[PDB]
Structure formats: C-alpha cells, structure tokens
C-alpha cells in the first residue's frame, strides 16, 4: 500500500465520469475544512496486516497533527503495483473500519471506481506532505 | 523518475520553511490559471536520456490536453529511491530547459528546497490525473 498524507485547511471533490464500468460505490461529492487528506494507493501484496499498519500509522499521525477528520481518498496513481479492482475496494473499505478503532474523528472514505474533480488548500508546515508504504 | 500529471483549472503555491540548510532556489509564490502541474520525483538512476524522455512526454501530453501552461513542481514524495538533492536540483533544472525545447507555452519551475503550501483545483476529466516512470 502507498498512501500520501495531506493535511489540508480545506477539501472537495465531486465524482464525475465512471472509471470502471460498474464503479462499487454510489457517486457523490464533498467538501471538508481541515482534513487529513489520504490519497491511499491498494497495492497487489495487500492483506489484513497491511490495513492494521496503515491504520495505526493514519491514527498516530493524525493524533500528532491534531486533526480530527481523516479522509480516506482512493487514488490510482502512487504505485505501478496496483491491486485489481474488486480487492482493492475490499481493502479500502477494512481501511476505514480499521482506522475508527483507533481514531475518534471523523473518517470519510470517498467513492471508489470514479473519476474525480477536487480542490485541496494544502498547508505548508513541516509535516504537512508525508509518504508512506505497508506491506506485509 | 516518477511525476504525477495534474490538469488543474487553477494552481498557487508559495515556499514557506526551508527544508533544506540552504535550498538552492530563492523562495517565492506564484498563482496561474489553467495549466499541467507535473508533481516530479527525481530518482537515483535518473540522467539526460531520462530528462529527455520526461519532457517529451510532458510535451506530448500537455498537446493532447490543449494546455499551454506547464508547472514543474518539484516533489519528494512519489518514490522511495530519490536521487539526492544536488543532482535532483541538476535534473529538474535540465527537464525545464528540455521541455522548452519541445513545449510552446508557458513553463514554469517551482523553487526546489522549500516546504510549500499550495492549492489546486484539479480537473475531472479522464486524462486529468495520471502518473509516468521514466527511466534510463
Ligand atoms: N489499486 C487502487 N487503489 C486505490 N484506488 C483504486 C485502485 N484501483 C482503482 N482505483 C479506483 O478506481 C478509479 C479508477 O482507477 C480510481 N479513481 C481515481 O484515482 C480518481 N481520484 C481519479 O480522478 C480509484 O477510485
Ligand atoms: N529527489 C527529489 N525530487 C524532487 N524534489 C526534491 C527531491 N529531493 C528533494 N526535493 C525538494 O526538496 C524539498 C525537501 O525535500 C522538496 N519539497 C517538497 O516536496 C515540497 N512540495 C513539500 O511541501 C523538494 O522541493
Ligand atoms: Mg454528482
Ligand atoms: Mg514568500
């Protein structure tokens, strides 16, 4: 898994066109102010462990930060060892549920399967724009 | 190397923090309409054949999408095997004057060193996020 951690003073997005014929989730869109944006790549090795991983590692940041909204944002483009399609929704979907055992705020994960608009205000400290990969 | 095409409506940015003891550019901000953010992570093997090979994809791209506005952002975040920070400064400094060669519009170089806050409106559209390896 490779994920990039923005945190933001605001977020949006909008899904637009259908990237897959039969996209898994619904379409939609949502604005946020400040987020934790987590632009969260599934790669082919992904499994269980990897999720915990990346889950306590998006807690502990988030709590460091002090943000108290995650965005969990499905993202293509961070790997060219991309999980299929169907797994990479299950993955992003235990994502989700993983993280909220372990972090209070809210967590938004955005439709999987679309192409998106968005626009991010992203801010300029320190730890701002972070990488991250978990494998198992 | 790895980049991360972005066809925004509109992008800004401006150098906050050092994050380099001496970055090698001034700092600065700068704020454009329409225009191809290329996110570029230099990597390790990456020499002039790779730059060649970037900016005439980015050329070739930037045609296809009808932009004539390019911003070379540079970004340590898309890979795991970045070429050190003298020679990704070398490399970005030879993708800007190669993609001059290739693109007419307006090409854009982004301060390298800095911790930046930035914003951008990015398009919906099909083509309007991908990612490219080049390599040599
Ligand atoms: N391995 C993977 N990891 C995370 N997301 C993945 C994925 N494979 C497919 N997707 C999703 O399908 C849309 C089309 O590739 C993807 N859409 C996006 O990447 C949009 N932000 C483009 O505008 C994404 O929702
Ligand atoms: N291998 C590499 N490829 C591209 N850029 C690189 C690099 N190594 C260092 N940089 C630059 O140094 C700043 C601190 O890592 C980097 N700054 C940035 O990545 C900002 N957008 C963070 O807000 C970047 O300018
Ligand atoms: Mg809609
Ligand atoms: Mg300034």
Redesign the interface.
Known sequence: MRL?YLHADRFEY?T??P?LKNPPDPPGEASFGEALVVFTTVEDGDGPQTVMYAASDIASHSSRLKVTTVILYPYA??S?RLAKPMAAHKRLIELEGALRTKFPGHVHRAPFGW????????????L????R?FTE
């Open positions: 990039l909008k637009v066109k990237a483009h961070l060219s192409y998106k608009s968005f626009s991010i205000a992203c801010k300029g400290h320190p701002a724009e972070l990488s990969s």
